[PDB]
Design a protein around this motif. Structure first.
Motif, PDB file in Angstrom:
ATOM      1  N   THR A 162       0.844  -1.178   0.000  1.00  0.00           N
ATOM      2  CA  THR A 162       0.000   0.000   0.000  1.00  0.00           C
ATOM      3  C   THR A 162       0.887   1.237   0.000  1.00  0.00           C
ATOM      4  O   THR A 162       2.074   1.169   0.293  1.00  0.00           O
ATOM      5  CB  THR A 162      -0.962   0.075   1.230  1.00  0.00           C
ATOM      6  OG1 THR A 162      -0.232   0.197   2.455  1.00  0.00           O
ATOM      7  CG2 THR A 162      -1.860  -1.157   1.351  1.00  0.00           C
ATOM      8  N   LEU A 163       0.305   2.375  -0.373  1.00  0.00           N
ATOM      9  CA  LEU A 163       0.995   3.648  -0.365  1.00  0.00           C
ATOM     10  C   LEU A 163       1.604   3.923   1.045  1.00  0.00           C
ATOM     11  O   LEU A 163       2.759   4.325   1.190  1.00  0.00           O
ATOM     12  CB  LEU A 163       0.036   4.750  -0.780  1.00  0.00           C
ATOM     13  CG  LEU A 163       0.584   6.163  -0.877  1.00  0.00           C
ATOM     14  CD1 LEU A 163      -0.171   6.881  -1.922  1.00  0.00           C
ATOM     15  CD2 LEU A 163       0.350   6.961   0.456  1.00  0.00           C
ATOM     16  N   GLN A 164       0.793   3.719   2.072  1.00  0.00           N
ATOM     17  CA  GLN A 164       1.248   3.950   3.447  1.00  0.00           C
ATOM     18  C   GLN A 164       2.426   3.055   3.807  1.00  0.00           C
ATOM     19  O   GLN A 164       3.443   3.530   4.379  1.00  0.00           O
ATOM     20  CB  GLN A 164       0.071   3.765   4.412  1.00  0.00           C
ATOM     21  CG  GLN A 164       0.414   4.028   5.854  1.00  0.00           C
ATOM     22  CD  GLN A 164      -0.776   3.799   6.746  1.00  0.00           C
ATOM     23  OE1 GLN A 164      -1.503   4.737   7.064  1.00  0.00           O
ATOM     24  NE2 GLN A 164      -1.011   2.533   7.114  1.00  0.00           N
ATOM     25  N   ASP A 204      -5.711   0.111  -7.775  1.00  0.00           N
ATOM     26  CA  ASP A 204      -6.512  -1.087  -7.719  1.00  0.00           C
ATOM     27  C   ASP A 204      -7.752  -0.719  -6.917  1.00  0.00           C
ATOM     28  O   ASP A 204      -7.690  -0.708  -5.687  1.00  0.00           O
ATOM     29  CB  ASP A 204      -5.808  -2.216  -7.037  1.00  0.00           C
ATOM     30  CG  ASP A 204      -6.697  -3.435  -6.864  1.00  0.00           C
ATOM     31  OD1 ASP A 204      -7.842  -3.454  -7.409  1.00  0.00           O
ATOM     32  OD2 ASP A 204      -6.331  -4.361  -6.142  1.00  0.00           O
ATOM     33  N   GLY A 205      -8.823  -0.336  -7.585  1.00  0.00           N
ATOM     34  CA  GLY A 205     -10.026   0.034  -6.822  1.00  0.00           C
ATOM     35  C   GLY A 205      -9.858   1.372  -6.131  1.00  0.00           C
ATOM     36  O   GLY A 205      -9.615   2.406  -6.776  1.00  0.00           O
ATOM     37  N   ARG A 206      -9.920   1.397  -4.793  1.00  0.00           N
ATOM     38  CA  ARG A 206      -9.729   2.668  -4.118  1.00  0.00           C
ATOM     39  C   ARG A 206      -8.304   2.960  -3.655  1.00  0.00           C
ATOM     40  O   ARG A 206      -8.046   4.039  -3.170  1.00  0.00           O
ATOM     41  CB  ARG A 206     -10.674   2.760  -2.946  1.00  0.00           C
ATOM     42  CG  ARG A 206     -10.560   1.724  -1.970  1.00  0.00           C
ATOM     43  CD  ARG A 206     -11.498   1.935  -0.806  1.00  0.00           C
ATOM     44  NE  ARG A 206     -11.407   0.777   0.043  1.00  0.00           N
ATOM     45  CZ  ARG A 206     -12.080   0.608   1.158  1.00  0.00           C
ATOM     46  NH1 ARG A 206     -12.920   1.539   1.575  1.00  0.00           N
ATOM     47  NH2 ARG A 206     -11.919  -0.521   1.835  1.00  0.00           N
TER      48      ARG A 206
END
Length: 52
Positions: free
Chosen positions: A4-6, A37-39
């Motif tokens: 994830t970005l985080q 990917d989606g949100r």
DNA sequence: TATGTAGTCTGTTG
DNA sequence: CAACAGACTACATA
């Protein structure tokens, strides 16, 4: 293998605010560019911030 | 020039 | 349908 970005940001040498990182994605300062990917974005493990 | 906060709004999720 | 991740912002101050 993707993050994830985080999670990606947290593992960078110099973590920044999540807003900052999202700005870098929108400006295409990340190589390879993340997948939306989606949100959520998915970053390759090895992705890095690059100069323009 | 670059970043951080804190607000509203939108699309995706479970 | 409510919570989440993000798109965007004005504004603050590096």
């Amino acid at each position: 293998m993707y993050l994830t970005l985080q999670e990606w940001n947290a593992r960078q040498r110099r973590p920044r605010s999540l807003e900052t990182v999202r700005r870098w994605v929108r400006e295409s300062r990340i190589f390879p560019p993340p997948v939306k990917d989606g949100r959520e974005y998915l970053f390759h493990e090895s992705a890095v911030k690059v100069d323009l």
